[PDB]
Amino acid sequence: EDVVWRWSCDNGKCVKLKNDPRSSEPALSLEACKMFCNEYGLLWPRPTGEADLGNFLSKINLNSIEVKILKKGATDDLMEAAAKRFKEQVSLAIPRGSTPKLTGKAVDVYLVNENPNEKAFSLEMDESYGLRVSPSGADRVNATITANSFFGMRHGLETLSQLFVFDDIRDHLLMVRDVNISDKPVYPYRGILLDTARNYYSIESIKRTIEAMAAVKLNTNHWHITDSQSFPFVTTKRPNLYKFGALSPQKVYTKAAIREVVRFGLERGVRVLPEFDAPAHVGEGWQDTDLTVCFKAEPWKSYCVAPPCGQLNPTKDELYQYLEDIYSDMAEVFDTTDIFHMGGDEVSEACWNSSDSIQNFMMQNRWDLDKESFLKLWNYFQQKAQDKAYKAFGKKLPLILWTSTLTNYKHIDDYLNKDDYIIQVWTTGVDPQIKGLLEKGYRLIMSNYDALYFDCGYGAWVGAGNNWCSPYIGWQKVYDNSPAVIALEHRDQVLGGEAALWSEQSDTSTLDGRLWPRAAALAERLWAEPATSWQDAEYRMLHIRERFVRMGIQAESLQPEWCYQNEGYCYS
Ligand SMILES: CC(=O)N[C@@H]1[C@@H](O)[C@H](O[C@@H]2O[C@H](CO)[C@@H](O[C@@H]3O[C@H](CO)[C@@H](O[C@@H]4O[C@H](CO)[C@@H](O)[C@H](O)[C@H]4[N+](C)(C)C)[C@H](O)[C@H]3NC(C)=O)[C@H](O)[C@H]2NC(C)=O)[C@@H](CO)O[C@H]1O
């Protein structure tokens, strides 16, 4: 049949009413009402600058959308790719199975890239843009996007595509008539950590993830590509690592596959940031190299915090030749990244202390078998690993490490320095380590586990009950979690945040639901740092969820669709 209802805006809420035949008032479709009833309409994330949507919509012909690139340059193929993708994205306003009438105005999109040669990812990159929409002559629409760089330009394309609504009452494709928007992200680093080691993720699912990221302007895919459970990274120089380390020969990331993902990311403003986690979290792949200790050590509880146990042996020099080669193979294929993540998850002192080679080596350096000495061994490892990373990437570049006993702000400056090392924070936001680190000059990526661990909440994967960081974290908690509140006056030292999906209990099948649409909550927090809380973003969050589903993403359902159709009636 055809849609029976209509919606009217009353005190910021779209309320459902019978579409009565005896009325001289034009009925509004659901999302047409939402576009002007909501403070920010259907936009996600909301702009940080001018956000003026005017009062009207204009009927648009889907086949009359043309894109013109005004300043040609070295980003030509990227801009042409993003332009070609524009039509497909506008089509996302239209629900599947619904066909818009081909009538209405023509749409001219004018892309102005002020520095058309700039293709590099950096923390200082300019992601700002400006968007104006306006009637041009009679039969057409002028959409002008102006940005300092390609990245701002394609963010602008994303926002513009969000200014289309499908009227399912009339079968009309509509677009906001008069728009003035200026926008720039609050934080340079907006990411998702994907663990592809604890379980395998098809590369299509990784690309699909990147798509969903670009839709909400997340700019960083942190690819945690190895751990103790597997080595899917294809290293041409050390091929036995992946041959013995992969879950199967099918479950692997080839050079061609990684290049595809990296390029796919670049086109969508997503930096693909590789991690090689060391000296802990190593395991499969290293068999018979004699370069590890404690692999599969039983009882595991006595050695590491989760099975299988395994750690690199810093005392073997051949190790750094392995490391150099791995980093080199990574540097070749992940060639858009300006940053390298070197892990540094808690090293087990028990693990290192159960080896003869290691104790002998520490005897000779006069170091003892106490704590500070194993901290010295770790530092020795990190200094050498770091040198090899610098060589592999052909330059010094920023390195990321997790908070750990090594990164304790009290002694951190013995080991690292704040110019070369960025610290990813997985503690709580109320943890004293954060203020210590900030006071000592260090930069942070907030992945605090009480608000940002997307794996929390499910059944236990060892024993019974629930998993370690339960309860499950709803989008509300991830929205209200503010790095500005956490870092206070030192907030410029916060580079941004990252949603972490650890994969002990997640893979190809579960990934859409794990990330979406909670990552969108993080996306807006990082993009706009709103002083407003989640309830103010609720309605738009429900819409963005629907947009994800339309994109083919299997996003988690937040609320009954009834709530979405009847704003204000679901509350607590
Ligand atoms: C086994 C047992 O009976 N333990 C009880 C507990 O009541 C309690 O100790 C708990 O033991 C668990 C297993 O040793 C600990 O779980 C582990 O926690 C770490 C984080 O500290 C997890 O690793 C991190 O998190 C992600 C996954 O979210 C993981 O993928 C990353 O590699 C890692 N890093 C982010 C740090 C890089 C780890 O996966 C998890 N392991 C599990 C669940 O097997 C748990 O932390 C610990 N709980 C507490 C509250 O300390 C202990 C309390 O006295 O008593 C033990 O008898």
Residue numbers in the entry: 23 to 594
Task: Copy out sentences from the published article reporting this entry, exactly as the authors wrote them.
Insect OfHex1 from the Asian corn borer (Ostrinia furnacalis) is a β-N-acetyl-D-hexosaminidase specialized for chitin degradation during molting and metamorphosis. OfHex1 shows high activity toward β-1,4-linked chitooligosaccharides but is not able to hydrolyse β-1,2-linked GlcNAc from N-glycans, thus exhibiting very high substrate specificity. According to the CAZy database, β-N-acetyl-D-hexosaminidase belongs to family 20, and uses a substrate-assisted double displacement mechanism by which the 2-acetamido group in the substrate GlcNAc, instead of the acidic residue in a β-glucosidase, acts as the nucleophile. OfHex1 also contains a -1 subsite and +1 subsite for sugar moiety binding, and the three corresponding amino acid residues found in BGlu1 for binding the +1 GlcNAc are found in OfHex1(Val327, Glu328 and Trp490).
Since we have obtained the structure of OfHex1 V327G mutant previously, in this study, the crystallization of E328A in complex with TMG-chitotriomycin was performed and the complex structure was resolved to 2.5 Å. According to the alignment, the mutation of Glu328 to Ala resulted in obvious conformation changes. The catalytic residues, Glu368 and Asp367 are rotated about 180° and 90° compared to those in the OfHex1-TMG-chitotriomycin complex but with similar conformations as those in the apo-structure of OfHex1. The rotation of Glu368 led to the collapse of the two important hydrogen bond networks (Asp249-His303-Glu368 and Glu328-H2O (I)-Glu368). In addition, the mutation of Glu328 to Ala increased the volume of the active pocket from 646.8 Å3 to 758.3 Å3 as measured with CASTp, suggesting an important role of Glu328 in constructing the active pocket. The conformation of TMG-chitotriomycin, in particular the GlcNAcII moiety, was found to be very different from that observed in the wild-type. The most obvious change is the absence of short polar interaction between Glu328 and the C3-OH of GlcNAcI of TMG-chitotriomycin. Interestingly, a water molecule was found to occupy the position of the side chain of Glu328. The interaction between the nitrogen atom of the 2-acetamido group (GlcNAcII) and the oxygen atom of the carbonyl group (main chain of Trp490) is missing, but instead, C6-OH of GlcNAcII forms a hydrogen bond with the main chain of Val327. Site-directed mutagenesis indicated the change of Glu328 to Ala impaired OfHex1’s affinity toward the substrate, (GlcNAc), by 8-fold and the inhibitory activity of TMG-chitotriomycin by 42-fold.
